[PDB]
Each structure stands twice: as C-alpha cells, then as structure tokens.
Design an enzyme around this catalytic site. Sequence first.
Site, PDB file in Angstrom:
ATOM      1  N   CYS A  85     -46.412  25.744   3.666  1.00  0.00           N
ATOM      2  CA  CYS A  85     -45.891  26.749   2.754  1.00  0.00           C
ATOM      3  C   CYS A  85     -46.061  26.305   1.312  1.00  0.00           C
ATOM      4  O   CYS A  85     -46.216  27.139   0.421  1.00  0.00           O
ATOM      5  CB  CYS A  85     -44.420  26.993   3.033  1.00  0.00           C
ATOM      6  SG  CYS A  85     -43.528  25.439   3.188  1.00  0.00           S
TER       7      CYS A  85
ATOM      8  N   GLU B 176     -36.627  31.339   4.502  1.00  0.00           N
ATOM      9  CA  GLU B 176     -37.511  30.539   3.668  1.00  0.00           C
ATOM     10  C   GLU B 176     -38.937  30.960   3.995  1.00  0.00           C
ATOM     11  O   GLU B 176     -39.372  30.867   5.148  1.00  0.00           O
ATOM     12  CB  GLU B 176     -37.246  29.055   3.897  1.00  0.00           C
ATOM     13  CG  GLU B 176     -35.775  28.700   3.598  1.00  0.00           C
ATOM     14  CD  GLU B 176     -35.378  28.929   2.127  1.00  0.00           C
ATOM     15  OE1 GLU B 176     -35.748  28.095   1.279  1.00  0.00           O
ATOM     16  OE2 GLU B 176     -34.703  29.937   1.811  1.00  0.00           O
TER      17      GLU B 176
HETATM   18  N1  LIG Z   1     -40.368  28.192   2.564  1.00  0.00           N
HETATM   19  C1  LIG Z   1     -40.498  27.282   3.661  1.00  0.00           C
HETATM   20  O1  LIG Z   1     -39.769  26.316   3.781  1.00  0.00           O
HETATM   21  C2  LIG Z   1     -41.565  27.488   4.671  1.00  0.00           C
HETATM   22  C3  LIG Z   1     -41.903  26.428   5.536  1.00  0.00           C
HETATM   23  C4  LIG Z   1     -42.914  26.570   6.510  1.00  0.00           C
HETATM   24  C5  LIG Z   1     -43.570  27.784   6.605  1.00  0.00           C
HETATM   25  N2  LIG Z   1     -43.225  28.840   5.739  1.00  0.00           N
HETATM   26  C6  LIG Z   1     -43.946  30.064   5.901  1.00  0.00           C
HETATM   27  O2  LIG Z   1     -44.134  30.240   7.270  1.00  0.00           O
HETATM   28  C7  LIG Z   1     -45.281  31.029   7.401  1.00  0.00           C
HETATM   29  C8  LIG Z   1     -46.150  30.509   8.522  1.00  0.00           C
HETATM   30  O3  LIG Z   1     -45.380  30.315   9.670  1.00  0.00           O
HETATM   31  P1  LIG Z   1     -45.489  31.381  10.829  1.00  0.00           P
HETATM   32  O4  LIG Z   1     -46.930  31.781  10.937  1.00  0.00           O
HETATM   33  O5  LIG Z   1     -44.941  30.813  12.103  1.00  0.00           O
HETATM   34  O6  LIG Z   1     -44.658  32.623  10.307  1.00  0.00           O
HETATM   35  P2  LIG Z   1     -44.147  33.808  11.042  1.00  0.00           P
HETATM   36  O7  LIG Z   1     -43.378  34.843  10.190  1.00  0.00           O
HETATM   37  O8  LIG Z   1     -45.410  34.206  11.646  1.00  0.00           O
HETATM   38  O9  LIG Z   1     -43.480  33.219  12.228  1.00  0.00           O
HETATM   39  C9  LIG Z   1     -42.283  32.475  12.104  1.00  0.00           C
HETATM   40  C10 LIG Z   1     -41.311  32.809  13.233  1.00  0.00           C
HETATM   41  O10 LIG Z   1     -40.873  34.157  13.176  1.00  0.00           O
HETATM   42  C11 LIG Z   1     -40.926  34.635  14.500  1.00  0.00           C
HETATM   43  N3  LIG Z   1     -41.010  36.084  14.498  1.00  0.00           N
HETATM   44  C12 LIG Z   1     -42.136  36.874  14.364  1.00  0.00           C
HETATM   45  N4  LIG Z   1     -41.777  38.161  14.368  1.00  0.00           N
HETATM   46  C13 LIG Z   1     -40.398  38.256  14.500  1.00  0.00           C
HETATM   47  C14 LIG Z   1     -39.502  39.300  14.565  1.00  0.00           C
HETATM   48  N5  LIG Z   1     -39.983  40.648  14.489  1.00  0.00           N
HETATM   49  N6  LIG Z   1     -38.194  39.058  14.697  1.00  0.00           N
HETATM   50  C15 LIG Z   1     -37.699  37.797  14.767  1.00  0.00           C
HETATM   51  N7  LIG Z   1     -38.552  36.742  14.711  1.00  0.00           N
HETATM   52  C16 LIG Z   1     -39.883  36.938  14.578  1.00  0.00           C
HETATM   53  C17 LIG Z   1     -42.013  33.899  15.183  1.00  0.00           C
HETATM   54  O11 LIG Z   1     -41.858  33.902  16.551  1.00  0.00           O
HETATM   55  C18 LIG Z   1     -41.842  32.548  14.611  1.00  0.00           C
HETATM   56  O12 LIG Z   1     -40.962  31.787  15.353  1.00  0.00           O
HETATM   57  C19 LIG Z   1     -46.002  31.026   6.101  1.00  0.00           C
HETATM   58  O13 LIG Z   1     -45.863  32.226   5.455  1.00  0.00           O
HETATM   59  C20 LIG Z   1     -45.325  29.941   5.371  1.00  0.00           C
HETATM   60  O14 LIG Z   1     -45.439  30.012   3.989  1.00  0.00           O
HETATM   61  C21 LIG Z   1     -42.220  28.711   4.761  1.00  0.00           C
HETATM   62  O1  LIG Z   2     -45.185  20.330   2.755  1.00  0.00           O
HETATM   63  C1  LIG Z   2     -43.977  20.379   2.399  1.00  0.00           C
HETATM   64  O2  LIG Z   2     -43.666  20.326   1.179  1.00  0.00           O
HETATM   65  C2  LIG Z   2     -42.852  20.509   3.420  1.00  0.00           C
HETATM   66  C3  LIG Z   2     -41.836  21.411   3.140  1.00  0.00           C
HETATM   67  C4  LIG Z   2     -40.785  21.578   4.036  1.00  0.00           C
HETATM   68  C5  LIG Z   2     -40.744  20.833   5.206  1.00  0.00           C
HETATM   69  C6  LIG Z   2     -41.769  19.924   5.504  1.00  0.00           C
HETATM   70  C7  LIG Z   2     -42.819  19.757   4.611  1.00  0.00           C
HETATM   71  O3  LIG Z   2     -43.851  18.819   4.903  1.00  0.00           O
HETATM   72  C8  LIG Z   2     -43.373  17.786   5.709  1.00  0.00           C
HETATM   73  C9  LIG Z   2     -42.719  18.293   6.975  1.00  0.00           C
HETATM   74  O4  LIG Z   2     -41.671  19.179   6.725  1.00  0.00           O
END
Ligand SMILES: NC(=O)c1ccc[n+]([C@@H]2O[C@H](COP(=O)([O-])OP(=O)(O)OC[C@H]3O[C@@H](n4cnc5c(N)ncnc54)[C@H](O)[C@@H]3O)[C@@H](O)[C@H]2O)c1
Ligand SMILES: O=C(O)c1cccc2c1OCCO2
EC number: 1.5.5.2
Lengths: 54, 1216, 107
Positions: free
Chosen positions: B827, B793
């Site tokens: 996100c 995700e």
């Molecule tokens: N679609 C969703 O539900 C959702 C929800 C929250 C955040 N996000 C996305 O998450 C991102 C921000 O979170 P973030 O900064 O922690 O993202 P990220 O990709 O930086 O990090 C997420 C995780 O991946 C791990 N990671 C990094 N490199 C890796 C590798 N080479 N192999 C395995 N694991 C690895 C990190 O340690 C961390 O635990 C944003 O792009 C956001 O849109 C999506």
């Molecule tokens: O901001 C959001 O829509 C969202 C999406 C997935 C998980 C979450 C979220 O906000 C509340 C905490 O956990």
Amino acid sequence: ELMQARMPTLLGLIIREAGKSALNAIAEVREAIDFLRYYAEQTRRTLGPGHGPL
Amino acid sequence: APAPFADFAPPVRPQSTLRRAITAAYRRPETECLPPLVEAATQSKEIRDAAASTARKLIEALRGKHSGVEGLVQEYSLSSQEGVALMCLAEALLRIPDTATRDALIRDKIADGNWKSHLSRSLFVNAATWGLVVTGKLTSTVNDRSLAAALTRLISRCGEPVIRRGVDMAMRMMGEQFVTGETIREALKRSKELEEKGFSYSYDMLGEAATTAADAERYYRDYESAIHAIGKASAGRGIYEGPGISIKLSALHPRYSRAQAARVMGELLPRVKALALLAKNYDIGLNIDAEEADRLELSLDLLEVLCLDGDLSGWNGMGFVVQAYGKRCPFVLDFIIDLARRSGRRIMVRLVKGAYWDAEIKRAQLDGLADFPVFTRKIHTDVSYIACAAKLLAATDVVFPQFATHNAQTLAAIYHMAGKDFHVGKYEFQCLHGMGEPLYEEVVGRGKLDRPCRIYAPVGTHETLLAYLVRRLLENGANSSFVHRINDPKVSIDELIADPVEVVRAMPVVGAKHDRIALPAELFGDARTNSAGLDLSNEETLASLTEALRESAAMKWTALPQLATGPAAGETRTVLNPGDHRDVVGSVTETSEEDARRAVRLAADAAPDWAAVPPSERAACLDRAAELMQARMPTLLGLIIREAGKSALNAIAEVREAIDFLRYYAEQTRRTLGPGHGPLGPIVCISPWNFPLAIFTGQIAAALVAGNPVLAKPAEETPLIAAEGVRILREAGIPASALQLLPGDGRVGAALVAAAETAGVMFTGSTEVARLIQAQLADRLSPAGRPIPLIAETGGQNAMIVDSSALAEQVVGDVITSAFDSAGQRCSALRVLCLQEDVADRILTMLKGALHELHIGRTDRLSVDVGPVITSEAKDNIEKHIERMRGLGRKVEQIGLASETGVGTFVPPTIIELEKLSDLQREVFGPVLHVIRYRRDDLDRLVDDVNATGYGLTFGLHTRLDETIAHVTSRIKAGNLYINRNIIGAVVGVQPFGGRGLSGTGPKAGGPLYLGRLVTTAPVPPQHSSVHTDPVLLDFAKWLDGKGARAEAEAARNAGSSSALGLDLELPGPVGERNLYTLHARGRILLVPATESGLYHQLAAALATGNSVAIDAASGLQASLKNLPQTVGLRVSWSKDWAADGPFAGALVEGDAERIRAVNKAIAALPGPLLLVQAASSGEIARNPDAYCLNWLVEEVSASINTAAAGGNASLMAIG
Amino acid sequence: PKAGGPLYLGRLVTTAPVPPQHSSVHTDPVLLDFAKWLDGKGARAEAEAARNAGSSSALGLDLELPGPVGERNLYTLHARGRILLVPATESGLYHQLAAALATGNSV
Ligand SMILES: NC(=O)c1ccc[n+]([C@@H]2O[C@H](COP(=O)([O-])OP(=O)(O)OC[C@H]3O[C@@H](n4cnc5c(N)ncnc54)[C@H](O)[C@@H]3O)[C@@H](O)[C@H]2O)c1
Ligand SMILES: O=C(O)c1cccc2c1OCCO2
Ligand SMILES: Cc1cc2nc3c(=O)[nH]c(=O)nc-3n(C[C@H](O)[C@H](O)[C@H](O)COP(=O)(O)OP(=O)(O)OC[C@H]3O[C@@H](n4cnc5c(N)ncnc54)[C@H](O)[C@@H]3O)c2cc1C
Ligand SMILES: [Mg+2]
C-alpha cells in the site's frame, strides 16, 4: 573600558543625581557598557560600505 | 517444474574450514572477540615503553609544526555559517570553467550585490560537507536560509576580497588537498616530490556504488585508463617502490551483493581479472578496497579465483584490504595468508580500521540481527588492529603487510613490534593524501624511522570527490579519531600514547559492548523485545534457511473454517504459487455464508468469557504468539514466499512485523487497559493478500487483546499463512471461541460484516471495498444505538519529490526499492516520482538503467528481486493500465521477462513518464512507477497536485535543504512521511502506519491510538497529551461565556485541555534515523447537531482539536451562532449540500438512534473518503463529557528522517 | 526595533544589513498561495519577488540567546499584525502584499 574603570565614580553621580541605589546604579553602568560592547560587536558582524548612514 | 528452494542460495564454492571460521565470527559477542586479540597484541614491557616514547616523539613533532579555512575565518571575522556559505559560493564559482569569466562575475556581479541573481541548484547542496570542513561537526541537512543570510551578510560586509580568498581556498582544497589531482596525469605529476623523499602511492579513482551497467562500464574504463597512466609512470619500479591503484568492487558491477553472487562471479570477476592482467603487465599494485560488512566474504570468492588464476601468475601486485574494526578480521587474515601460501602469490594486505562504522551499526539495528559485525568501542578496534598486525608480521614471507593508519600510537606499536630488521618489501605503512603526510614525514627516510609509507591518493573532479567526502572526513574527524584528538588542546600526549591493549586488559569486563549502543534486540529497551531478522549474507544462515525452506515446501498446508465448535466442512480448492501455478502450496476449505453467520453468533456467546480474561493475560497470549512466530520464522518464510509470491527478504520483514504487532499491542495493553475499557464485542477482521501474515496478525491481535472475540476473514488469495497464524495464536492460548478463522472470498467478508452481533470491523484493502463495507455498516447500530466502528485502511497514490540537491544514486536506490519491491504490491509503494526539471534527465537515465538490473522470477531463489503479482486478474488489470498509457503516447520503460515467468502471473517493473500528475486517476497496485517533472518554482503547486488525488498514505522527499523540508512537510497531507530514504517497510511503533483521505480512517496500526478504537471507552494512551491549547477553541469558549452558555464554555475549556493536538514525539528506533510522531487537526469536520447545546459541544470538540467545521444547515441552529469572533467564524461554514462541501475528515452527530442511523447513511453516501463518525444522543452529551472522543478528531502523522543521508551519523561521532 | 537586539542598528542606516542569525526555514503559507496566484496571472516579476520575500523573511526565527546558567533566554520573530498598505500601482500593491504576507501579516 573607560566606563568600566570609572564605574565607582559614575555610581556616585547616578546615586545622587537620579535617586538610584548603589545596586541600581551598578546595573545602570553595566547596561551602558553592554550597549557599547553589543553595538560594537553587531557592527563588526554587519556593517559594510553599502550600509550608508542616515 | 523446479523443486521449491532447490536452488535458493547455493554458495559460490564449498566453504573451507578457514572460510567457515570467518563466517562463525560474523556477529560473535564482543566479549568473546577481545581476549584472544588482547593476547595476540601483547608486547614486552620494554617494547611498550619504547613504543610510548616513539609515539610521544611523533606526537610532539605533529603538535610542534601544526588551517587555511581557519585563517580565512579569522582574517574576515567570519561566523561558522559565513565560513560554510563562503565555501559553498567558492564551490559554485569553481563550476564556472573559464577563469576570466569567473573573475568577471566575481568583480562585476557577485561582489557588488545580489549573488542570488547570478548563481536550478542551491548554492548550498554540499554545505554539510563544508560544515564538516569549517566546524568539524556534521549536520545531515543544510539550513539553506541561514547560509543565504550569512552569504549576503559576508559579501555586503567584506566584498570581493573575501570572495577571492574563498575561491582560492576552495580551489586549493578541492584540487590539491581532498584529491592529489583532478586527473590521474595531474596526480602523477604531483606525486614525484614525495616519491623522491621515499613515499609511494596508491591511486583511488573515487568510484563506488555503480547503479547501472553504464556506470560500472564508466568506472571500468576509468580504472583501465588509470592503470595505463600509473604503469607508464611506474616505468618498471615494481610493486613496492612504484605506484599502484586501488579499486572498489562496488564500482564495477551494479549488483555487487551476495544475493547476486552468480552475476558477480560471472560478470564482475572477469572485469577485475582484465584490470589485474593490465596491472600485471606494468607490474604495479592493484588493491581491492574493503567496503560494507555484507560484502566481505563475497569479495573473498573473487580474491580466491584471481589468486588461483594462472593467467595472473608471476605478479605479486594483487592487494586486499581487511578492516580491523570487523570481528572476522583475524580469521579473514588466516584465510588470506593460507591463500597466499596455496597460490604462491605474496598478497599485499592493507590493514585498516574501517570506514563504514556508523552505517554498520544502523544496518544491524534495522535488520534486527543478533549483534554487530564490527566492534562498538573504538579501543576494541585499536586492539584488533594491533593483534592483526602481529599476525601479519609473522607471515611477511608470504604476504606483504601494509599498515594504513594515522594514529601515532598504533604506528609506534607496530614499528617496534616489527623489530630492527627491515628491508623495502617486508612491510610498509600507508596514509591518506593530505592527511597523513605530517605524521609520516616523521617516519619515512633515513633521518626518521626509515620505514616506507604508501599514500592513498584520491583522484577526481570536484563532483566526484564531494560525493562521499563526508564519510572520508569522519574517518579522522570524529571525537574518538586520533586526528581530531591530536588537534584538541584538552587532550594530553599521555592520553594519546595510552596503550589500548593494556587499557582493555584492565577493564572489568574485557570486550564489553559500548554502553550507549543498543543491540538490535534492545532497540526499545524495557518497552518490548525487538523482533529478530536473519542475515541473508551469512552462509550458515543461508544453508540452514535452505533446508528449512525446502522442508516447508514438503508440508501439507491447509486452511479450514475454524469455528468455535471445531473445523467446518466446505468447498475445498488448491492454493497455487503465484510465481508458478504448477507449484501447489496447499488446500483451503472455504466458509459457507451460513457458517460465517454461525461463527458471529458463537463469537457473541463467547464474548463475556474472553472479556473476562484480564488484559495482562490477554497480552501474555500475544507475547507467547510472538515467541512462537519468532521460533517458526524460517518455516513461515517458506509459506509466505510460495503462497504470496514474496522474496525471502520481504518474508522476513513480514514475519518481523507480525511479531512486532503482537509485542507492541501487548505492551500497549499493559500500559492502558482497565476494567472501564470494555470490549466492543465480536470484531470482524478482514485482511489483504499483500501482507498476509503481518496485517492479518496486527488486526486480530489488537482486537483480541482489547477483549474482543475475533472473526478472521483472510484474503481469498492467501488463506494458508492466515491459518498458520491462527494456529499459532491458539497455541499461545487464544481460545478457539475467541479466534475463529473463516477463509473465503468477499461473500464471507460481507456475511460477517452484516451479521447483527458484529460489533466492529477492521478492514485493510481497497478503498472501493471499504466503501461497500461502510455502506453495509451504515444500516446498523450497536445495541446501545451507536455506529459500528470501522477501521478502514485503504490505498495510496504515493509520491516522492526529488530536488536538485538530492544524491542521484541514493534517490535511485530508494525509488527502485519503493516502487518495485514486492512487485509494487505494498500500500506504501511509490507510485509517482516527481523530479525537479534540472536533474530529471540524469536521474531518469539512472533509474532506467537500474530497472534493467532487476531479476524477476519465482521467489524461491535469493537472486530474485521482484516476484509475481498475486493473480492473473491483478496482472490483467495492471497490464491494461500500462497499455492505456502506452496508447496515449507516454514513454514506457519495461524490463524483459524470462520465459520461465510464463508459468506464473508476472508484470515486469515498468516506468511510465507522465505529463501531469492528473494523468494518473486510480491506484495501480503493481510494479508501475510514474514519473513527472517539475520546475523548482512550481514545488508548492506540485504538493497541491499530490494532495489533490485525495489519497494521503506515504510520501517521500529527497532534499538536503531545510527550507524545502519545512515547506514540503508542512503542506503535504499524508500519514507517513519519509525524508531521504525509501517510503516502504513502516516499522511497528516506530513509524505508526496509516493515512488520511482516501487512504484511511485511522487510527494508525502500530500506533498508540489503535487499541482505544476497539473498546467502548477509549483509554489515555501512553505519552498522549499536549500543553498547547487551540486559540480558536479559546476564542469560542470566551464567546460562549459572553452568550451566557457557562456550562458549555467550561466544557469547551476542558476540551481545549483534553485535546492532544500538538503532541510532538520522537519514537525510539535505530541510530541514524529520527522517527517523529505528531498529532494535527484532521481537517473539516461535518457537524450534524440536533440541539443548541449539542452544537456547542460538537464545536468545542472540533475546535479543540484544531479543525474547521461544516455545520448541517438543516439543523435550523443558525441563530445559535450569532456574532462569532472572526477567528471562529473563519473555521465555521454551514452546509445545505454535504456532498458539495466536502471532503470532510470526520463527523460528529447528535440525535436519537434513528436520527443517528439516518445521518450515518447520508454520510456513507458522501463521495470520497470514509468518514470516522462519532454519534451521541442529547442526553449522552449532557451526561458524558467524553461523549465525543477527541482521539478521533486529530490526525496522526509519522515522519521518518534518514539522518545518515549526508554520509555519516553526527550523534555516533561522539560514541567511542 | 528592540534596543540591545540585532535589528537595532539596521534602522540607523539607509540600507539595512542582514543581522547575525536572522533567517528562518519557514515560509508563510499565505505568501505561497499568493505567489501561485501571481503565477497564474502571468505576473512573473511579482511572483518572483513574492517567492524571494517568502525565503528572506525571518518570520519564525526562534533562538536561544547566550546568557547565565539557570535561565533560558529566547528570542523569536512573529508577525507584526495588520499592515496598512498604501499602494499607488497594481505592481506596487503586489510587492507590498508580498512583503506583508511573507512576514505573516494581514493587511
Ligand atoms: N493502508 C494500509 O495499511 C494497507 C495495507 C495493505 C494493503 N492496503 C490496500 O489493500 C489493497 C490490496 O489488498 P487486497 O487486494 O486484498 O484488497 P481488497 O479490497 O481486494 O481485499 C481485502 C479484503 O477485503 C475482502 N473483501 C472483498 N470484498 C468484500 C466485501 N464486499 N465485503 C467484505 N469484505 C470484502 C477480501 O476478501 C479481502 O480479505 C490495496 O488497495 C492496498 O493499498 C492498504
Ligand atoms: O510497506 C509498509 O510500509 C507496510 C505497511 C504496513 C504493514 C506492513 C508493511 O510492510 C511490512 C509488513 O507489514
Ligand atoms: C591509506 C588508507 C586506506 C584505507 N582503505 C580503506 C578501505 O578500503 N576500506 C575501509 O573500510 N577503510 C579503509 N581505511 C580506513 C578508514 O578510511 C579510516 O581512515 C581508518 O579507519 C582510520 O583509522 P586510524 O588508525 O587512521 O585512526 P583512528 O582515530 O585510530 O581510528 C579511527 C577508526 O576507529 C574506528 N572506530 C571509531 N569509533 C569506533 C567505535 N565506537 N567502535 C569501534 N570502532 C570504532 C573506525 O574504524 C575509525 O575509522 C583506509 C585508511 C588508510 C589510511
Ligand atoms: Mg481483491
């Protein structure tokens, strides 16, 4: 209103001229009454000066 | 360095005994509130009989002298839709200022033909309001195509005469009925007639909910100019005989809230004082209107300072509304009466029932609070009102009671309660202009009851009055409303004069909650218990939270590699508060790559023991963990605030989400999992820093409850709350061998992903990192020789489209929240706002003004709106983007940051105006809103442009127009849609969350397909079926039968039935919202067959789920699909270059293990979205009808529609 | 059109009225694509006519009609099928296409 009031007489003619049962003849006259009242209402809902006849 | 939470939320003043009694009653159970009100409202049998007789006399007079619109509808035989459309047209024609121009347009252009050609803004923007006027029924959105048809029909049928009558009707209603006048001078001119009869006036300048400093200043100068006009006209008549003014505090400051109490007292209070000083000089009344329940106690702090301010001494005109539908009302009155005694000011107290009832129900449900701050049965409000009138009538020496009501029964009860001794100044009644005069002309004057009535007189232009006219109509227009009932011929006078005090007294349970209104805890009924929030407007809650938050900052938080065998040694470093690096939050010991690989082997060894725990008992662990998190919420808040840079509000919602995940997946397990749904095995859960408890908990809880042991790899930035979550899950009964915590960076994550025993990966994070995990997993097969499941995700490029029918104030609030909440580190955050050109400048001005009202800082203060970004690297990346845009000449608006932000990593909320959506080429994960403008005719192209980014996570639409809703929601390709609300804060099981394309593989977290991805054989989710059969599937099955492929034709028909394509559900949730969940086609599925029969099975699976396909041309199976029906051929393409023919939305693969591995590697190499790949051998296709699971060939879509957006809740109009 | 239905009278006048309840909030997606294509060509009058056809089309109308208890009587408007277009001019063809596509038809 006239077809409703005269339904029994109309039934007699439909039964004998068209081979219909009494039940079917009643439904026939009802449908004619409903066409009249339905197109009357649809007219009251829609037709204005710009909807010229054919 | 300021001590953590030392200044979290100090009250304006120490809470007196009387103030504390108010707060204590905030959400008191309804059964406890009513008995003392019943006792206080009790009157003698003689008085009750006299009151019933008076009420009957008033009601007989009302029904004996008893619309303009109704006569218009009757004269021209208008349908309801025609009546509404006519009034919308009349409203539009009255936007033409010059009368002769308007009349020429009517005669020469409108009447003779196309009204559309002559009248950027839908005619029907306010049709929900006119619908209430014409039909008495509220609709939240406008069927503008029905109205357009009706308007054409009525004009072509009736011509200019009906337009003229509609214009004259709308002119009278909007100029003389909904308002006393367009301007205060006009209103004053029209007041003389009824003043001569004994009425008085209080003018309502219709301002409220300032969004910007400039708005608040405009409302201020409007009140100031009105006070002069009113005071000049009063001409020394004084505060009882002469007119006064009513103000709304929310009009006078853009941040009128408890969270901003210091700004309220410093900036709003002096403005009220200046207006009150002018009212004092003219000796007129100045009334403070009552608004939402979370503003009541704050407004008391302003009332207190004003009444104690010696500069206002000598004047008794200060007035204050108290809402009898509120549980605190009698205690508020005790406080006000005492303040009147202390100050020596005879406070004018307007007793009302209350105007925000529907909204208060919705808010308490959304916030998961203990109970409502208002009653839920209308009769309870009536008893409360009468009880509070008894209190007020005992204190007429020190306050001036003003009984605002249109209910003749309420009136009569108080008239007799007050007794025979009367003098002007003792008390008065009040009513609304153009609504209460029929009743009170039976009251005012020596020939009637000889009691005075003050008319609340709205003053404003058409634009101003329409803005919140819906709320004002519902007050007297709901099925339980007196004014609605007096007009209902099926309601008898005996029913209307029923004594609410005696009716409540006789009920089996005095004060029972309304049967049809769920307490927030019971929103989901028997399915699960809703998580509970915290009321940050409650001083008791703020005081307890202050202490819990301070205590949480004194704790020695740590995160360690928690292997099955115990904690492991490793490199230890501190964890710093992103808002102030001097604030050390705890210490993390990070996992070595050797220990990460050891942890997977330990999870593999423990997998049988955990799978053997029955699903119901695994679910019981999750439910126990949810209870523990609920009880620990205040401490968890403190950790999330300091470790992750979150505000208290956002931390509450984060902990609630974790609790909801636990309880949702527990219930989904109890609904589905059985012995044949075997676990995958060890699952690696990799979680992001931005939801460091909720998404962390969700992934782990799902995997655990599906029977899989978990390796939990939290974000390197936020290990402490993860360690606490694991501690709680282990306390709840998850064995140490089933849940191992491995803190560290991506190297720990990668070592886990690559470990041979890793049976599945749940990743939430950036699309780029997901792509790296996808590539690593493509090297591997399960022991059965099938792809390792990946739930990934990822990011979004989330847009909101706003057309000219949206209410700018609503839009701006939803945009400011969606874009800048959590510093845009959701996100779901709004990245691209799309404004229809005709309203873009006005909304942008309001947006920039609202931007500058945000408070950015360290988040251990309630007054902080926007906290830091997570790291200096995040800050640098966001800033580089902003400066690139600025260097390209794009207009950039930024709030100025306080010097105190230098100790942390902050990015100011930023608005960047783009020329085209394609100017934005990457997700910028920060507080950066991009704004584009669009022409109305280019809406469809704009939706194309939004879809063209390849993302598909959240999407917002603000419109009142059903045609636009239908168009946009049918064409947008995103997983979470939001209509007339913000686009953030998806709620587990209500808006199942997750997108498509570059935003995710699915299935959605917090949705019913999720657990099925974590077992080797997916169960049938609750409610998961569809009676619809894809017609192309049916054509394909017939073609198969014609080719002699009888077994495949049967399998195709079975796929058609098994498919849940077309599922269309409404999920339980809060009132005032419709939450929809639907299953659609995914898109184009890549088919990689090996045999003809395999191809036919693949095609059947894909077509049954509504998809098109691209078939690998290297399969050599072209001759197997000769002479397809055109309908099927339209869905079939052949691909020699898979990368050129994408993006795909999934893949089906047939082959032996090494063919599957090779194909999986080739698919991982395709640019763009991560594809959900399903593979099967030829023998598996022959043996297992579910070799390809149809769950993963449909796309889930969640849509959340704010149905209160028009200003009220139509469903709750029937709840009394 | 159907006897005893709301389109019937409109066939018997030279300019058809808008029947009661005759509207739809749905817009044919192929009509929309055609309008955008016309926009790109600068065929501004035709693109406007296409959008207007998309809006005034009642394709997708789906009503329950009043009748006896114990029965649900539904009335729905679907595409006719494939419409024969006999144009004379390019603009005429674009207008004919707009009308046919807006009502869900092939041509
Ligand atoms: N679609 C969703 O539900 C959702 C929800 C929250 C955040 N996000 C996305 O998450 C991102 C921000 O979170 P973030 O900064 O922690 O993202 P990220 O990709 O930086 O990090 C997420 C995780 O991946 C791990 N990671 C990094 N490199 C890796 C590798 N080479 N192999 C395995 N694991 C690895 C990190 O340690 C961390 O635990 C944003 O792009 C956001 O849109 C999506
Ligand atoms: O901001 C959001 O829509 C969202 C999406 C997935 C998980 C979450 C979220 O906000 C509340 C905490 O956990
Ligand atoms: C002159 C004037 C000024 C006012 N100023 C304000 C103000 O500043 N702030 C404000 O909030 N209101 C204010 N009101 C009240 C509000 O606008 C409504 O007019 C008022 O609540 C209607 O009550 P009633 O006695 O006229 O009619 P009724 O039909 O007797 O009472 C209707 C009221 O019952 C209550 N109610 C309805 N359903 C339920 C339910 N299921 N459970 C519990 N209660 C229910 C609601 O309060 C509703 O408005 C004012 C009213 C007047 C006349
Ligand atoms: Mg990262």
